[PDB]
């Protein structure tokens, strides 16, 4: 475990993370994809061997000894708000199981279903709150990665609000 488990946020490419494992915002088919998924495919392509997994699940594949946790959030273009919200919560619960199983002291994690799976809606708060619900019972240091300057400020505010 971490000595004093924390949440932090950084605005940069998650492929450059300083943590013991990474969560990919994956598609269900284990394809290279776009956004975070394509950055992850370029950095850890070996981790895409048999990485296909259903919506609401996470599947870990090792790149050398470095664990890549493929977490499949729902595409809100296809899911109802109700069913999508359940699947997004479930994906983060499966991430927390994997992080615990792996014994890592830190994890890099993007906000699932906030990019091309958002169905055109701002889901920062929805996605971050499901992240916290899953990860609060873990003792890994969690580093959240984002790309937008306004999102960095809002995520940082949300973390600081609870401390
Ligand atoms: Cl960067
Ligand atoms: Cl997305
Ligand atoms: Cl972002």
UniProtKB/Swiss-Prot annotation:
| Impact after mutating residue 36 to A | Partial loss of mono-ADP-ribosylhydrolase activity
Question: What domain of life does the UniProt record list for this protein's source?
Answer: Viruses
Ranges where the Macro domain occurs: 4-163
Residues that bind ADP-D-ribose: 13, 27, 35, 115-117
Q: How does it sit in the membrane?
A: Peripheral membrane protein
Q: Where in the cell is it found?
A: Host cytoplasmic vesicle membrane
Q: How is it modified after translation?
A: Phosphorylated by host on serines and threonines.
* Description of its domains: In the N-terminus, the macro domain displays a mono-ADP-ribosylhydrolase activity. The central part called, the alphavirus unique domain (AUD) has a zinc-binding function. The C-terminus region, also called hypervariable domain (HVD), is mainly disordered and binds several host proteins. This intrinsically disordered domain contains 2 SH3 domain-binding sites and 2 FGDF motifs necessary and sufficient for the formation of nsP3/G3BP complexes.
- What function does the entry list? Seems to be essential for minus-strand RNAs and subgenomic 26S mRNAs synthesis. Displays mono-ADP-ribosylhydrolase activity. ADP-ribosylation is a post-translational modification that controls various processes of the host cell and the virus probably needs to revert it for optimal viral replication. Binds proteins of G3BP family and sequesters them into the viral RNA replication complexes thereby inhibiting the formation of host stress granules on viral mRNAs.
Q: How does the annotation summarize its subunit structure? A: Interacts with mRNA-capping enzyme nsP1. Interacts (via C-terminus) with host G3BP1; this interaction inhibits the formation of host stress granules on viral mRNAs and the nsp3-G3BP1 complexes bind viral RNAs and probably orchestrate the assembly of viral replication complexes. Interacts (via C-terminus) with host G3BP2; this interaction inhibits the formation of host stress granules on viral mRNAs and the nsp3-G3BP2 complexes bind viral RNAs and probably orchestrate the assembly of viral replication complexes. Interacts (via C-terminus) with host NAP1L1.
Please state what the protein is called: Non-structural protein 3
Q: Which part of the complete protein is shown? A: 1334 to 1493 of 2474
């Amino acid at each position: 475990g971490a000595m004093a488990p924390s949440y932090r946020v950084k605005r940069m490419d998650i492929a450059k993370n300083d943590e013991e494992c990474v969560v990919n915002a994956a598609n269900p088919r284990g394809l290279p994809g776009d956004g975070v998924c394509k950055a992850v495919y370029k950095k850890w392509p070996e981790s895409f061997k048999n990485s296909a997994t259903p919506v609401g699940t996470a599947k870990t594949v090792m790149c050398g000894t470095y664990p890549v946790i493929h977490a499949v959030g729902p595409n809100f273009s296809n899911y109802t708000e109700s069913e999508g919200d359940r699947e997004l919560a479930a994906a983060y619960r499966e991430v927390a199981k994997e992080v615990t199983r792996l014994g890592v002291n830190s994890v890099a994690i993007p906000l699932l279903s906030t990019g091309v799976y958002s169905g055109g809606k701002d889901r920062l708060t929805q996605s971050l709150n499901h992240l916290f619900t899953a990860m609060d019972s873990t003792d890994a240091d969690v580093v959240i990665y984002c790309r937008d300057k306004e999102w960095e400020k809002k995520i940082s505010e949300a973390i600081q609000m609870r401390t």
